Design a protein around this nucleic acid. Structure first.
Ligand code: ZN
Lengths: 78, 204, 60, 128, 99, 154
RNA sequence: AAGAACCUUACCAGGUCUUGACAUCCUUUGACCACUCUAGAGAUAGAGCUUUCCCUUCGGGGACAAAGUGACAGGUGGUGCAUGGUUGUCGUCAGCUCGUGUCGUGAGAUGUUGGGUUAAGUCCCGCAACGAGCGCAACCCUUAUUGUUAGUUGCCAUCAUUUAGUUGGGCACUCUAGCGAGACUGCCGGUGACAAACCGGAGGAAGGUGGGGAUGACGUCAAAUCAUCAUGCCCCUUAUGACCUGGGCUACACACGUGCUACAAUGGGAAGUACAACGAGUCGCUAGACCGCGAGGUCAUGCAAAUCUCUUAAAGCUUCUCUCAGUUCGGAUUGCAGGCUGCAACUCGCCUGCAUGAAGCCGGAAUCGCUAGUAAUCGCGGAUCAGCACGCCGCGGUGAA
């Protein structure tokens, strides 16, 4: 709902700037709950620290319509 | 709890607000300003028996007026302690500040003075019964029409609490034309906290 | 933990959406009027004292 | 000519009526009874002061009235008409007052109460 | 006529007697004054429960009746302007002259 | 209630027909305080009465409210530990009230999508003494005096 | 809890402190800063001008840093059965007491009991009681009519008008708000112990406490609140205190209390077409004009308010379509595309459009509210809010057994 530009977290943007032309690091120990995906992100693996532990997961090219907070749920109903 | 402040019942009917103001768009500043001016007075109220502080508003001159039963003990030496009050006071406000000393008379019929005096005597191992009796007898003999007094807390340094008091003179309360005074005071000896309440009536 | 959280308002916030309002003489974060900077009941207690200018009891 | 004024009040409304001899007409806010006011059939209601006082007319009406809803301000027209008919001839007062229809309804909307849901409606309360 | 004054305060007898003093100075030191026009007395409301922790079924409501006063003076002299901008007392009423 | 009797809430007749009974017919049908719709359907129902086989519709109303309106009633009482009943009298006010009550009961579900020929043919056929409401009155008279036996000694 | 992205929010997963985040005192004091960058999930470590005496009497005093130092600071950690304070309920029920006289060997009683009436210990008759006080009632506020005083930002009766009360004029009306009058069983008839009292009649705007509020005695329930505050005692006080990031606290196999919209034709859809009152406002309400089906966007206008704006009120009324169906009823759930606010609205915000179109045709045993402008229905306003309402408070329209 921000058609004046979609939003990325800036230190995560700092690390993706550090690692696009360089090689890639799977360890990204932060939240990234304020960072969407658009197709210039595919290939990185993110260990989303959901405030409890961190959840390593990579990026798909159809994992592109949305942000970076789906894959570490904080409910755990079982 | 089902009873109401008569000072709340009679404000704006037969008595007035203290901070006689009008304040459009600058109200909270003067509100907490005046509340802090109210808070500083604990140096006086320790031993000088001030009762009320009527607070006025000039152009930009700060105007209060205190009421105590000792005129000489607040003016000090020649007018040297009142100057000390102005000096410590103008640091707090930062405005043209002026204080008035209006000597209130007849301390034998108020509520805050007599009640705070007997709240002082409750600390000094005094029989509270005769304290109530001597207070109501000295209040009646200065001209009155009724006194009610009641004390609550851990009385006599003991078990489960009480709430009682003795009262003389036919005081009306549920009417309006009252001009009566209410005051609440705290006093601890060593066991928690004890409180007193006090009532008068002086015509209409 | 009130006395640190009294000072929590006395600093500037990290950004705009945290400047919450509370009472001044007490520190209740709830039910404080923004006009008088007093809470629910400290307003009520000072209202009976006849010390706030203006306010009376309302009946009609 | 001589104008016949009339005031009108009912149910949080206000009606100023100006009355004049003529053919029997009604103009409310420069409009007829069926123009400014819809379908409502208040012929006996509005012209019932013409029931016994100059039956059934015929005088003409200019009136400027606002406030409230539609029927409540129409109830204000009785005051202007019957009051003005009193102003013309005092001798019709008894025949009106035996049927009444002159005194103001002193009644309007009830003050609420806090705690209750309405002015007298209490909440549904389970026994326990 | 190039002078008009408003008095917005609380106690209406302080209000209208101070209005009477400035109308006194007006019709003494000039001419052609209008009346003391009143104004529709705006009123707010407040509402606080009668408890501390529970018991929502009993409250208490307070209010703020602010009376307002309005006075216009027609064709004055600058001498009564000197009287009006310098006379100040009482205190609980708004003191502000306008065009 | 408990101290004794009470007032009666006097009413005023119509703008046209000048009848308190039709006024009561208006104030029974009025749902949620909307008097415009009830007035429209009642005057148009009298217009439908006046078209087909009707001359004085107040009088066909009065015939209908002769032959639906009762003369007796039952009342489910109790005396000393059991639930009984008794054939009871009726005031003329409650007599008209129960007549209007039964009519507006069967004026609900005739089956016509007209909101008023159910009403019109209701009071027509009640003046013709047909439909279920006149038979409802006759069943009320039927269930009366069969319970005369176990209620004449109380 | 009158507002629950983060904060609030004490519960946790990490990463961090020890005279401390906040107070007072001694010594050096001391005019203390800010900004930029390097790096963190940040809070913070470091480098760059670095904070700079307001009376100088030849002696210092103020803004606070920062440091030594301990006095210490601090705790939403426990005890409503240790408490002050404040509050629910009996319940606006109508009782509760004292002086003098008298009776009783005394505790004590009488009064305050009997007959009538009221909302009432309200009032009458009677009786060894005669009176008084706290209560009830009244004195206060709002509303029902009218007079005076003051006529603009209000109104337009007597004149000209347009986009108009506009412009000139007027204060006639209406309205605004200070003071007044008016209603007290005051009078007629009947009933009653003639008394209290009940009903009918008059005038009157209002007749029988006009309508409505505010006002809650003696006391009961060791009722509720150490989490607003204060507060004895107990315990922590290199940690139960302190700092920050990220998450909850509506996760749900289910049961309960309160509320909203339906299950249609007294209605649904399409078009045209009238009338409120309370309030709210400068970093806010937006006039007018333009763009988009839209939510909204732009240019830009009046206003610290009887002037300007929210703000044409909804239900109304007059036509046209639908013709009793799981249906033009219903709009739950879901996809897509959008707006709005903050730093982003995927956990967890509000709204718009398009696409689907459920359960659901008045509900068992039981159960709730209500006595007249009320019940039922329909809109509107704001406290506090950045945004966030079926909740709460308040106003008004229609209006019944
Ligand atoms: Zn407070």
């Amino acid at each position: 709902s921000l058609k004046k530009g979609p939003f990325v977290d800036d230190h995560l943007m700092k690390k993706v700037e550090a690692q696009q032309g360089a090689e890639k690091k799977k360890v990204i120990k932060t939240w990234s709950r304020r960072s969407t995906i658009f197709p210039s992100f595919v290939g990185f693996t993110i260990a989303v620290y959901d405030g409890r532990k961190h959840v390593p997961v990579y990026i798909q090219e159809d994992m592109v319509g949305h942000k970076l907070g789906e894959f570490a749920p904080t409910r755990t109903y079982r | 709890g089902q009873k109401v402040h008569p000072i709340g019942m009679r404000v704006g009917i037969i008595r007035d607000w203290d901070a006689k103001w009008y304040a459009e768009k600058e109200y909270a500043e003067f509100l907490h300003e005046d509340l802090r001016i109210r808070k500083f007075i604990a140096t006086k109220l320790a031993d000088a028996a001030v009762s009320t502080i009527e607070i006025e508003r000039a152009a930009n001159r700060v105007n209060i007026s205190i009421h105590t039963a000792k005129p000489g003990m607040v003016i000090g030496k020649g007018g040297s302690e009142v100057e000390n009050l102005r000096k410590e006071l103008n640091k707090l406000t930062g405005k043209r500040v002026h204080i008035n000393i209006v000597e209130i008379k007849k301390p034998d019929l108020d509520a805050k003075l007599v009640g705070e005096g007997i709240a002082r005597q409750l600390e000094n191992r005094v029989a509270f019964r005769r304290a109530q009796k001597q207070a109501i007898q000295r209040a009646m003999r200065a001209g009155a029409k009724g006194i009610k007094t009641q004390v609550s807390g851990r009385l006599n340094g003991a078990d489960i609490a009480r709430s009682e008091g003795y009262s003389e003179g036919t005081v009306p309360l549920h009417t309006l034309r009252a001009d009566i005074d209410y005051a609440w005071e705290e006093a601890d000896t060593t066991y928690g906290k004890l409180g007193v309440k006090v009532w008068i009536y002086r015509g209409e | 933990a009130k006395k640190s959280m009294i000072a929590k308002n006395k600093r500037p916030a990290k950004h705009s959406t945290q400047a919450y309002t509370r009472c001044e003489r007490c520190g209740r974060p709830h039910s404080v009027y923004r006009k008088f900077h007093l809470c629910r009941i400290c307003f009520r207690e000072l209202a009976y004292k006849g010390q706030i200018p203006g306010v009376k009891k309302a009946s009609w | 000519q001589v104008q016949y004024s009339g005031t009108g009040r009912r149910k949080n409304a206000v009606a100023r009526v100006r009355l004049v001899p003529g053919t029997g007409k009604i103009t409310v806010n420069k409009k007829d009874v069926e123009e400014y006011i819809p379908h409502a059939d208040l012929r006996e209601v509005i012209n019932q002061p013409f029931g016994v006082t100059e039956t059934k007319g015929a005088y003409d009406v200019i009136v400027n009235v606002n406030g409230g809803g539609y029927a409540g301000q129409s109830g204000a027209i009785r005051h202007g008409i019957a009051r003005a008919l009193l102003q013309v001839d005092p001798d019709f007062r008894s025949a009106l007052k035996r049927a009444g229809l002159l005194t103001r309804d002193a009644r309007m909307v009830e003050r609420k109460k806090p705690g209750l849901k309405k002015a007298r409606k209490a909440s549904q309360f389970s026994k326990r | 006529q190039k002078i008009r004054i408003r008095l917005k305060a609380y106690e209406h007898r302080i209000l209208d007697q101070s209005a009477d003093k400035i109308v006194e100075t007006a019709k003494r030191t000039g001419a052609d004054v209008s009346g003391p026009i009143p104004l529709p007395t705006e009123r707010s409301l407040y509402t606080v429960i009668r408890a501390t922790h529970k018991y929502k079924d009993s409250r208490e409501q307070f209010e703020m009746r602010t009376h307002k006063r309005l006075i216009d003076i027609v064709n004055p002299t600058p001498k009564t302007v000197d009287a009006l901008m310098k006379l100040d007392l009482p205190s609980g009423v708004n003191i502000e002259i306008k065009l | 209630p408990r101290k004794g009797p009470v007032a009666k809430r006097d009413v005023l007749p119509d703008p046209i027909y000048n009848s308190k009974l039709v006024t009561r017919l208006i104030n029974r049908v009025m749902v949620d305080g909307k008097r415009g719709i009830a007035a429209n359907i009642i005057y148009n129902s009298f217009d439908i009465i006046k078209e087909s086989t009707g001359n004085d519709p107040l009088e066909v109303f009065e015939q209908a409210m002769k032959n639906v309106m009762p003369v007796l009633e039952v009342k489910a009482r109790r005396v000393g530990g059991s639930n009984y009943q008794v054939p009871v009298e009726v005031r003329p006010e409650r007599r008209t009230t129960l007549g209007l009550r039964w009519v507006v009961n069967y004026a609900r579900l005739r089956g016509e999508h007209t909101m008023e020929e159910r009403l019109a043919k209701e009071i027509m056929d009640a003046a013709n003494n047909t439909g279920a409401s006149v038979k409802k009155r006759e069943d009320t008279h039927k269930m009366a005096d069969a319970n005369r036996a176990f209620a004449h000694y109380r």
